[PDB]
Design a protein around this motif. Sequence first.
Motif: not given
Length: 31
Positions: A5, A7, A10, A24, A26-28, A30
């Motif tokens: 990822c 990130w 992370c 991914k 979970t990163h894009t 919110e």
Amino acid sequence: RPFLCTWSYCGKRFTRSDELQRHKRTHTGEK
Ligand SMILES: [Zn+2]
């Protein structure tokens, strides 16, 4: 590391694309 990822604070790696894709989300994602 086939998948990762990459990130900040992370950097989780995966061996399957669907797992990375799912991760991914979970990163894009919110709200
Ligand atoms: Zn991550």
